[PDB]
Design a protein around this ligand. Structure first.
Ligand SMILES: NC(=O)C1=CN([C@@H]2O[C@H](COP(=O)(O)OP(=O)(O)OC[C@H]3O[C@@H](n4cnc5c(N)ncnc54)[C@H](OP(=O)(O)O)[C@@H]3O)[C@@H](O)[C@H]2O)C=CC1
Ligand SMILES: CN(Cc1coc2nc(N)nc(N)c12)c1ccc(C(=O)N[C@@H](CCC(=O)O)C(=O)O)cc1
Length: 206
């Protein structure tokens, strides 16, 4: 009872691995955020009945979610926090680490629940990305790449797209991405108020 399913990571990072700035998102990518929403909510219709996805985030990302958009709707949220004094949420779990999170869900959401889980996502930030990257169940990176050098204070832990990791991490066909995400997605670059971006799916053999 601990690790059964895979772990998917999802990020928006610039060519230089910058993922944030001043504990915040230094860019307004409203359709980028719809991809996000889209991706993280998607459950196959036949399963659309009992099944839900799980979004894992570090304490800081949680604070970065507008009160308006918290918890993420249609998804099980789990905030990773050691410094859990008292989390504040009506069915918004608090795990002390990534594997603890994973046995809480497995514990709290099994056969005896009218609520199941399909997919689990690590939706950030930096430190949580780090531990996701070392976890033996992480095999897929749903990354959005912005072709703009935006000054970021926090960087993505592993340079997964670079040549040094090019024997592990492979970028899948646009086809594979869409199928996985179940719905069609923009191919090529998407310009949205200044930044040039694009969607990619990286996969690794566990
Ligand atoms: N591009 C993107 O998709 C995203 C970018 N970001 C950016 O990342 C930055 C925040 O990064 P980061 O500072 O790392 O924040 P995180 O959101 O990862 O918060 C880290 C905090 O969360 C808890 N935590 C995280 N990992 C662990 C672990 N392995 N064990 C225990 N507790 C853990 C701890 O909380 P405690 O203090 O309780 O120990 C730790 O201080 C901001 O710039 C944010 O905007 C964030 C999300 C998505
Ligand atoms: C800081 N993070 C991470 C984040 C933003 O964009 C990303 N894009 C990717 N690819 N991965 C990520 N992890 C993120 C987030 C911040 C806010 C929301 C958020 O509010 N989404 C709400 C808001 C709804 C809306 O704005 O439309 C939702 O319901 O999905 C999500 C993530």
């Amino acid at each position: 009872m601990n690790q059964q399913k895979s772990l998917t990571l999802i990020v928006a990072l610039t060519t230089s691995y910058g993922i944030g700035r001043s504990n915040s998102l230094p860019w307004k990518l409203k359709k980028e955020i719809s991809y996000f929403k889209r991706v993280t909510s998607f459950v196959p219709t036949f399963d659309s009945f009992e099944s839900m996805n799980v979004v894992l985030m570090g304490r800081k990302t949680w604070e970065s979610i507008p009160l308006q958009f918290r918890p993420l709707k249609g998804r099980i949220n789990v905030v990773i926090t050691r410094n859990e004094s008292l989390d504040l949420g009506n069915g918004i779990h608090s795990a002390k680490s990534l594997d603890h999170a994973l046995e809480l869900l497995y514990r709290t959401y099994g056969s005896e629940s009218s609520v199941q889980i399909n997919r689990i996502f690590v939706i950030g930030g930096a430190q949580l990305y780090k531990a996701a990257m070392d976890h033996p169940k992480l095999d897929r990176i749903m990354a959005t790449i912005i072709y703009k050098d935006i000054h970021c204070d926090v960087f993505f832990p592993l340079k997964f797209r670079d040549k040094e990791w090019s024997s592990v991490w492979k970028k899948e066909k646009h086809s594979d991405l869409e199928s996985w995400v179940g719905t069609k997605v923009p191919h090529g670059k998407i310009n949205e108020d200044g930044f040039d971006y694009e969607f990619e799916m990286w996969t690794r053999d566990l």
